[PDB]
Amino acid sequence: GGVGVDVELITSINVENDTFIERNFTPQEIEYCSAQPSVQSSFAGTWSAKEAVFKSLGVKSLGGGAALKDIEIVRTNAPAVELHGNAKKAAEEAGVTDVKVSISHDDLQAVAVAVSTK
Amino acid sequence: GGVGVDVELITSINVENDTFIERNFTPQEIEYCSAQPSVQSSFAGTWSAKEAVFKSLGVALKDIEIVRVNKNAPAVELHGNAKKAAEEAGVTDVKVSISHDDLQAVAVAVSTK
């Protein structure tokens, strides 16, 4: 048992800002979002997924200038969560054996829901 | 394990477009939505449910049927390719929940194997 939800306004992601993007998204993530019909929506969705996933872990919370590059969404095909660094340790350290995530958006906002297994 | 989410703008469903409705909704689905206070919201909700459900399987949407009765959780009933690919993935059950406000509808589904 673990569940997480995250909703983001599409305009919360500034795509121009290379520093922020590259800082928070893995290369496979950035390449995926860039290839989408709406790049900004795509980043907003992946961002929601990262947040939703972290929430489903239920761990010592995060915060600026903490980064979410740890939590990777691999959309290669249903999404896949792959954890790294602290994210990964704290997940094993909580007994979390798997995380699943789904993502959606419309014109207004993006939503992501994650469920964790322990 | 399996989760799906889908969000739709209420105005993505044109209730007037008989072709589209008839192509994507089963007769009982159509009857249910039609009997609701807000028909367009109802269709947008059932549509989100179908999308969410398909996503939770991890594999036209008339195959995925949502059987709703107000005051009782919706039920998912799969058909055709939807059904095969679900058994073919080991999916033993799918649950769905639906909601909307003035702006949009959201649905979340979880699948079991």
Place this chain on the structure above:
Amino acid sequence: GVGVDVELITSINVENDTFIERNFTPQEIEYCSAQPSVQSSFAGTWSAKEAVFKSLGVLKDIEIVRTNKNAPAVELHGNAKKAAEEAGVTDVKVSISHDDLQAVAVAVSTK
């Protein structure tokens, strides 16, 4: 069991003392009142209660315990609690989110 609920932030009238006090526990009310956006907070807890009820498959009965830096916990009472045991529901988890427009909550129940 799964439940989702989405609410417009403005669906909660904080000036409606009757509704607030009828639907939220004192802990709940105290929590929401201490937040940066009180109305968003109430809208979020409200979505959670609704989401949780849906996941049971069967609202002051359904209480959401919130403290910052932590995931919410569901604690059931009264009829809510009986009907949950009476359904074999062994645990309920909930997550909450909002933006400027609306709040969303998703709950999953165990049997």
